């Protein structure tokens, strides 16, 4: 079931959100820290079904951006389907420290044989969204690498297909 959120624009008229057209829907693509969008709990991969009661179906990323900019007043209503493509997988580092994948540009690119990633069905061509409760969207690979390296044995990752 979708949920309704009401966002209040900031001083600058902004909500701290970038949207993207995927498969003829609209998805949240970047949520700024401490923003009108983060306040209402929007996350990378949330699907936006309506903006101010208007269907988003078939909208380009440009159209969606323009609609947000053109919205009358200070509040914007959105109807949201929470992260419809989320998969969260818990892995465990082996006795010598790795969970068993390689990534680049925030995307998993290979899975190591006989590893915890292999055991737990981690997939390639998937974006890394969260690690152990920490949002990593928008982080540099080196920052993601550091989070993985310093993690405790248990490494829980939320992934989504890279569309």
């Amino acid at each position: 079931d979708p949920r309704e959120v009401i966002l209040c624009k900031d001083q600058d008229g902004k909500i701290g959100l970038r949207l993207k057209s995927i498969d003829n829907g609209i998805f949240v693509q970047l949520v700024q820290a401490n923003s009108p969008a983060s306040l209402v709990g929007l996350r990378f991969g949330d699907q936006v079904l309506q903006i101010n009661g208007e269907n988003c179906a078939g909208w380009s990323s440009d159209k969606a951006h323009k609609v947000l900019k053109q919205a009358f007043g200070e509040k914007i209503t959105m109807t949201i389907r929470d992260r419809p493509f989320e998969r969260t997988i818990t892995m465990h580092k082996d006795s010598t420290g790795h969970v068993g994948f390689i990534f680049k540009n925030g995307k998993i690119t290979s899975i190591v044989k006989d590893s915890s990633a292999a055991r737990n069905g981690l997939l390639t061509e998937h974006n890394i969204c969260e690690i152990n409760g920490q949002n990593v969207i928008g982080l540099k690979d080196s920052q993601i690498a550091d989070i993985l390296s310093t993690s405790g044995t248990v490494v829980t990752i939320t992934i989504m297909p890279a569309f």
Partner: peptide
């Protein structure tokens, strides 16, 4: 990167 390397393996993680």
């Amino acid at each position: 990167d390397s393996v993680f």
